[model samples]
Target: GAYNEWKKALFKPADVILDPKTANPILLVSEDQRSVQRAKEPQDLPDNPERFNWHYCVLGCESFISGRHYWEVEVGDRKEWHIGVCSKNVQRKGWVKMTPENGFWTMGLTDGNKYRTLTEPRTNLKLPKPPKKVGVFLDYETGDISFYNAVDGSHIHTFLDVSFSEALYPVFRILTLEPTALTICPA
Candidate 1:
């Protein structure tokens, strides 16, 4: 048998951006909203009547309730970060862990090189190479969210058999305040 692989052509590319409206004030969102960087102080004044939180996270502007979607993020070996999708009904305030139990299907690099998924009990990943650009693929109909190392075209991990109740929004968590920017790759 041939070496089965996750190729980019299998899924439809999605052009999504960081939603400044849902983003934490401490983070700086780029003009195009495709990039986000953690800052020392508030980048935006949270004066809107119904606004955000201190949770170092932001959501993509687009929300999907059906169909398959794929997007790439340039992380560039970020020390700590989380990227995936979260249910629209999930809490967007305070400090909450990103897990399926909390409506977030995310995988991230913690501390430095520890790659883990926010499953119920959590699952760790051991990749042959750290992906500078990560590909996130979501099969909404099948409730499967998977990740791939775009650099080597290798499968990273997946959250399977999920029960998605509502529209899902792409989420990005900059866990470290080291001035690293996460860029959402354009289609």
Candidate 2:
């Protein structure tokens, strides 16, 4: 009964496509708009002000201002990656920090398999193992952004009591030359 209730109450998952315009110049988006990877060379794309200049990150095409939203991303063999949400007007140029003070609520995995949430002082999270797929849930009204292991729906970490002034979009970051890929899992 408890499991059924939890399953029914879980937010309906959504398909989040990578927004090419908001991606860093060195990132490449898949044709299906579902996956992103590091490019061998910088792409010949527009230098839009909305593009991330110093970060190897990309924003999802979809955004939410209210209600609940859920999405999963497949981080295939990536040793260093970051995933979370950010305010629509977050800084897009130069060295934008990954703290909530900078309008970001996110978590990351480093090369050493270190897990962390990008907060003011930074929070270190210990996981049983690096998650292959990560599920992110955002409740706009309550300002809760949670991360989970997509395989079994187990809680990993969450950013609680966040403040959102504008629409928030999903963001993903990758740092590696080994053809790392992050794909937005379909609903």
Candidate 3:
């Protein structure tokens, strides 16, 4: 019961929303700002400095400056979707890989069945089945970012022993060309 009790206690739901200004032209944030999907064709969005100029990425309006934060992502039938936290000052124009060294810590699914945690060595998450929902836990003090299969709250992997010098924002990315959404589940 320790893990179950600890799992419920660890959750400190974060109020995160998709930032329209930071979304790439290829991504369309839902009206509620809880979900995002690729546009049928690129939307004529303002090519501003705050926007992601290259990658189909978007940042959440909420930024983590301190303390524990938890949130779940509704991982729909996406061929490839990346969900996690990134520095508010992440790369905007370049196609940088999602790694903690570059201020990104994420668990993503791609290549049909492979799950990965984008760490220094790039770790693989060995789950028995694909997760329909993914949980993220971020703690500022220890700089630990953990991932979970939200359906049963099972541990996936944790980005351990890191430091957060800057504000971290929830980042979502769609790697497939097909129209699919990654939604932020309300807690």
Could you say which candidate leads in TM-score? 2
Comparing 1 with 3 on TM-score, the higher-scoring candidate is 3
Provide the overall lDDT of each model, using Cα atoms, as 2-decimal numbers.
0.82, 0.85, 0.84
**Which tens-of-lDDT digit does each residue in 1-187 have in candidate 2?**
4422463375756678889999998998899989888888899988788899788889998899898888888886788889999999888888877889998888988875889998879889999877898988999989899998877667899888877889999999887765667888886
Pairs in steric clash, model 2: none
Stretches > 4 Å off in candidate 1: 1-9, 47-52
Span of 10 residues, lowest total lDDT, candidate 1? 1-10
Model 3: clashing residue pairs? none
Runs in model 3 with CA error above 4 Å?
Answer: 1-8
The better-scoring model by TM-score among 1 and 2 is 2
Candidate 3 least-lDDT 10 residues = 1-10
**Positional deviation of 15 in candidate 2, in angstroms?**
1.9
Candidate 1 overall Cα lDDT vs. reference? 0.82
> Highest lDDT among the candidates is held by which one?
2
